[PDB]
Amino acid sequence: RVVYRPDINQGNYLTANDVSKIRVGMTQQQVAYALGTPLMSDPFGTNTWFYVFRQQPGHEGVTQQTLTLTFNSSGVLTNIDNKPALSG
Amino acid sequence: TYAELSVTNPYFTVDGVSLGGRLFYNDFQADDADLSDYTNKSYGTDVTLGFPINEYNSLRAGLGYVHNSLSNMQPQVAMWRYLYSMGEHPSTSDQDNSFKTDDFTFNYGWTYNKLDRGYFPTDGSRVNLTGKVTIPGSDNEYYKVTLDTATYVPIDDDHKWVVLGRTRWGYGDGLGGKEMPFYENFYAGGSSTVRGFQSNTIGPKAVYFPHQCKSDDAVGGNAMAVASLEFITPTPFISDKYANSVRTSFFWDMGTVWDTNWDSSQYSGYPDYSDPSNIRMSAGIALQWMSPLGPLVFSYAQPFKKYDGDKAEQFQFNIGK
């Protein structure tokens, strides 16, 4: 549990001063401008973006900030679900 | 271990006049072959310029400088005769001995690479000829000539039944009394030259002096004339549809090596190894093949006529030279 392994970093670099840019009713293209493009999007038949910020350096504890936002058809932001930590 | 360094510029002059410099490093134990046991260590340089005269020919020329250093030559007639010639008092009774030379030289040669295919050649000819002469100076005043020939002639315009001739000639004595006995000498037997005779086993076997009689260990010789007539065919069984790259050949080889200066007077009691009449003979079957990992050869021979103690090597295999 000391054998070295490279840092893991995954997903969009969310930050506490950008996420406040997300507010209901923005058009999806301007959300793409506000937070950059999503590294994950739901393939299974509905228009949702899964922003994830995740780091796991060395062997220190995994840290995560997942940010789920739903667009209705035609691309208007309907909601914001923020989980500020891993489920643990 | 063996090492060398070579680099060439195709145009020292715009006529294709290339200049190639070769430096080398050699560490040789004669016990690593059938050769009578002594250590030979050497290094040196040749500067060589290579250029054509017509078509595919090349000429080459080049000075060279070389270092040689010898140690622990087992006490036998030939080696002490080399010392004598050089005028270094032999330690005949004790093999605790050493000897070095620095030597200075020129070489010349010819190539007539009228060949057709690097692999499975059917209609082509090659001649490789090189001469070495020491230039007035050096420690050793030897001269050497080496000639190698290969010719392909198809009996069938379908180029399946090609005859492979080879011959191999050489000779070297030197100016005055500084012979070429012990440091540059030709060998026969192995997978190259006549197959079926052990590596370098053909030639004179030296005579001991009593130490702190005739022995069957080879010293090599300074006169040589290897030959091989090799007859090549379609293979009778293999899956020609795939195997058309695999070569099968029937061959008959000639080997002779001799020493001009084996004195049948002083050595009246020991075999007349200066006679070239003792030609060794071998003939047999060989396969040669290219495979993704490397090229392969297999060859068995009956060495059907040979002289006493000539160590046979009935079957050879090698990959990747």
């Binding site: 393939p43 299974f44 038949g45 509905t46 | -």
Partner: protein, 51 residues
């Protein structure tokens, strides 16, 4: 060589109820159009007999 026969036949996923798979594009092979030609080692590798 034969090794490209016996490749497993394609079998389209079944979309589960209440959702659908992505749109599909690019490396899609059009069906054989009832091509009656030879297969494998039976194919005549030689060039056309004449223009």
């Amino acid at each position: 060589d034969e090794a490209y026969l016996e490749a497993a036949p394609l079998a389209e996923l079944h979309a589960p109820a209440g959702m659908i798979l992505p749109v599909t594009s690019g490396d899609y092979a059009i069906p054989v159009t009832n091509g009656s030609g030879a297969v494998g080692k039976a194919l005549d590798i030689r060039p056309p007999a004449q223009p």
